[PDB]
């Protein structure tokens, strides 16, 4: 079933290997992979999604060179504190969520474009936490493997 996921682990990626340059917050991505995956499948998708958004603000260059990876290629997400380099995993989750129709690019795009709607996006995710955690399982474990292989 999830055989297309192993290609999505690339066409979403587009780069998180030197767009995440300088080997600091780059080699921190293996931590993201392993720990976040383990915690999503022990704690939950919501307790982890909160923890992830807390490390990446709204309406800033984070959002700029996060949505820039929706219609562009060169997005050097550089910055030492994992806040532009923490939106890596956030974008990883969001690209899957949109390209698998779990949530629609209409609602998401229009939602992360004004403060009123981030609450509603987060509530929508809360309503789809089990579905998302079940589907994104293999797509994420693939990146936990891709890290310990390449990253």
């Amino acid at each position: 079933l999830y055989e297309e996921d192993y290609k999505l682990a690339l066409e979403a990626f587009k780069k998180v290997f030197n767009a995440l340059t300088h080997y600091g917050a780059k080699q921190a991505f293996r931590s993201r992979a392993r720990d976040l995956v383990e915690e999503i499948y022990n704690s939950g998708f919501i307790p982890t999604f909160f923890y992830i958004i807390s490390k990446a603000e709204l309406n800033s260059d984070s959002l700029d060179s996060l949505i820039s990876l929706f219609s562009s290629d060169n997005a050097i997400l550089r910055g030492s504190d994992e806040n532009v380099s923490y939106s890596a995993y956030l974008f990883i989750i969001l690209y899957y969520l949109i390209k698998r129709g779990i949530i629609e690019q209409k609602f998401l795009i229009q939602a992360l474009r004004c403060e009123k709607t981030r609450l509603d996006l987060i509530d929508k995710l809360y309503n789809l936490a089990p579905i998302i955690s079940a589907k994104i399982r293999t797509y994420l474990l693939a990146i936990k493997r891709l890290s310990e292989a390449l990253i």
């Binding site: 192993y6 682990a9 690339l10 693939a142 493997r145 891709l146 310990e148 292989a149 390449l150």
Partner: protein
């Protein structure tokens, strides 16, 4: 045709072909080439009569005959030259089988039917395939084989390097009925060798190939190992090491699991790596991935296997037969290892 005959005629011959090439009409073009002969026929005086007006026409008539029939026209010289190299290869594989403690039931030229222990079957297949092409390392009696020829004490006889040879190994219990064992071996060979296709590169372009496979079976486990990876299997001397270059990869991997450096879990672990290794189009990523699949199952400090990265993307297929076969060479390798090791049960 251009490449046969160094002499002074090769240029003449390729000019004849330039004539034939693009259907230049009957002798409506030979005026381009008869020159290249009539300038040369008059280098000698003892030539009695003049007969160069037609022989240049018969030459391109013959070359067009070949190129338009699509096959080299056979002559008795062709047949004796073939079926003598066939018996020479017979004499070579005879001493090859005896080297690996085998027992030759029958081995005539192309065919072979021998019983070997499951331990020296990969080694034997590698050696016998490379020798059938006429390329080896040791002397096999008095047939001292050398890179496409067979040197018998300074006499160079040719071999069959361009010919493909298939294999069909059956790992059978000593008590299995030989009737069904022989029938299944013959059937696997004659059937699988004509129904399975693997990704081969032809003039720098991936196509599909049919023959040169090694079909292992063990009571329900099957695996296919290509032995060509180039559809004209040999066109230079660089090709003679590509021959069965996967069987020595499987050998290297077998001599890591004996030494206890790699665990047999390596054979029960590749699946959770293939689903990612096949959807990939980046070489230097697949290399890391296989290194991690080997890293996770090694037992010593740091093993080194380094699959040759020309096996990645090799896609085996089938025309819907009851033979089940993984569609990638890297998984057929582990299935071949599972078969071999089941042979030591």
């Amino acid at each position: 045709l251009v490449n046969a005959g160094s002499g002074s005629i090769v240029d003449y011959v390729k000019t004849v072909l330039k004539c034939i090439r693009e259907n230049l009409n009957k002798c409506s073009c030979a005026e381009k080439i008869y020159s290249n002969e009539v300038a040369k026929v008059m280098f000698r005086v003892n030539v009695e009569k003049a007969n160069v007006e037609e022989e240049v026409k018969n030459s391109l008539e013959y070359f067009e005959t070949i190129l338009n029939e699509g096959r080299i026209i056979v002559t008795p010289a062709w047949h004796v030259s073939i079926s003598s190299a066939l018996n020479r290869g017979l004499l070579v594989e005879l001493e090859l089988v005896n080297k690996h403690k085998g027992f030759v039931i029958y081995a005539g030229g192309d065919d072979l039917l021998a019983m070997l222990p499951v331990d020296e079957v990969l080694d034997f297949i590698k050696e016998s395939r490379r020798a059938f092409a006429g390329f080896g390392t040791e002397k096999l009696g008095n047939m001292c084989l050398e890179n496409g020829f067979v040197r018998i004490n300074n006499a160079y006889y040719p071999s069959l390097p361009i010919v493909g040879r298939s294999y069909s190994v059956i790992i059978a219990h000593y008590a299995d009925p030989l009737f069904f064992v022989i029938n299944d071996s013959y059937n696997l060979l004659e059937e699988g060798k004509e129904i399975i296709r693997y990704r081969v590169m032809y003039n720098g372009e991936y196509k599909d190939a049919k023959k040169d496979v090694a079909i292992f079976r063990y009571q329900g486990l099957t695996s296919v190992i290509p032995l060509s990876l180039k559809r004209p299997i040999v066109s230079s001397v660089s090709d003679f090491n590509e021959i069965a270059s996967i069987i020595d990869v499987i050998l290297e991997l077998k001599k890591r699991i004996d030494e206890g450096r790699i665990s047999v879990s390596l054979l029960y672990d590749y699946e959770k790596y293939k689903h990612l290794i096949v959807a990939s189009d980046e070489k230097y990523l697949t290399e890391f991935l296989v290194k991690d699949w080997i890293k996770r199952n090694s037992l010593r400090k740091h093993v080194e296997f380094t699959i040759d990265e020309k096996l990645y993307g090799v896609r085996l297929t089938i025309e819907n037969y009851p033979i089940k076969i993984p569609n990638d060479l890297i998984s057929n390798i582990v299935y071949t290892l599972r078969i071999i090791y089941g042979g030591e049960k």
